[PDB]
């Protein structure tokens, strides 16, 4: 829905002569807790031989962002299994927070690839501090000096069905 980012660890159950295994951690994006948990178990069953019955959860913690309103360039390495074999992808965002960036990503993948939330994988978020190592261009053009641009053809959303005025946009 509207998204959150969560921190999870699983501590796969103490068996005799191997108590306290190695506390496998993930950072997982979802709107709530239990969805987050289920995705941890889903990735974990993929990544090594676990089941939920053979595993147990340590904690859930919402990861707030350190300095939200810092505008950030993010770059995200992802995978998705579309109808073909699975395949990788990188994308780049100018945005405010990790969570909002992946929100926009999920919708854009939905547009351009008919890509579902269920069949997306995130590998990784990263943040780029220095400019000019961003690979893409459509963010890169939003980085120039003394920037100005217009809102052409602005339209006003009236409640009424009539207008008596012969409207205009401006310009």
């Amino acid at each position: 829905a509207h998204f959150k980012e969560y921190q999870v660890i699983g501590r796969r159950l103490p068996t005799e002569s191997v108590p306290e295994p190695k506390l496998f951690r993930m950072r997982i994006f979802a709107s709530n807790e239990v969805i987050a948990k289920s995705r941890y178990w889903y990735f974990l069953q993929k990544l090594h031989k676990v089941k939920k019955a053979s595993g147990e959860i340590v904690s859930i913690n919402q990861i707030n962002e350190a300095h939200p309103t810092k505008v950030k360039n993010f770059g995200v390495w992802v995978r998705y299994d579309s109808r073909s074999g699975t395949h990788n992808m990188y994308k780049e965002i100018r945005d405010v927070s990790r969570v909002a960036a992946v929100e926009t990503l999920y919708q854009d993948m939905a547009a351009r690839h008919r890509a579902r939330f269920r069949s997306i994988h995130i590998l990784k978020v990263a943040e780029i501090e220095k400019t000019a190592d961003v690979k893409r261009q459509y963010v890169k053009q939003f980085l120039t000096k003394d920037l100005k641009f217009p809102l052409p053809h602005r339209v006003q959303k009236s409640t009424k069905t009539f207008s008596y005025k012969r409207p205009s946009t401006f310009y």
Binding site: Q137, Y138, Q141, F142, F149, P150, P152
Partner: protein, 191 residues
Amino acid sequence: MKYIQTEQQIEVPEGVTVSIKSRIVKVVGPRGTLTKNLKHIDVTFTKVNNQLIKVAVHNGGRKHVAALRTVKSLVDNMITGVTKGYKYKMRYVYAHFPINVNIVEKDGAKFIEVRNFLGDKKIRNVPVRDGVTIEFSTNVKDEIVLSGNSVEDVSQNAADLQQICRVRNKDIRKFLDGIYVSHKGFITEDL
């Protein structure tokens, strides 16, 4: 990739003047004037100062911006067509049958009249557009010259004219005769 702002420069020389309300243009220079509507094209114009004008698009798709570069070159063609003026030169070649080519005026119509084409009796008239003048070649055989400001009018008229003699059902490799263009120059000569 949804380029945000695209733009081109057009260079006004000292002599010529240009008046641009909304997407209408007039361009006036020593040879004369021209006008053009561009309301179908959805761009913006701006002066910076008086030797350079900027066209631009915001939020361009590929089609929109390719149109931008086009409209620049159109207006530059008008500018050239005032300061130089354009001049298109043709020849009318025959193997057996000499063309009789003439100019006539029917109520002010400025038709161009060809006879004896391929031993025909047919008269073919071609109109002349406004803003373009003819001359048959003095001291050059089998040649005609057109000159004007509107390049589009000139080329359309001559392209029509060679499109009239599209000789039909007959082997083009044999019937080399016809009326064709020698070259596309400007009026001046010097500059």
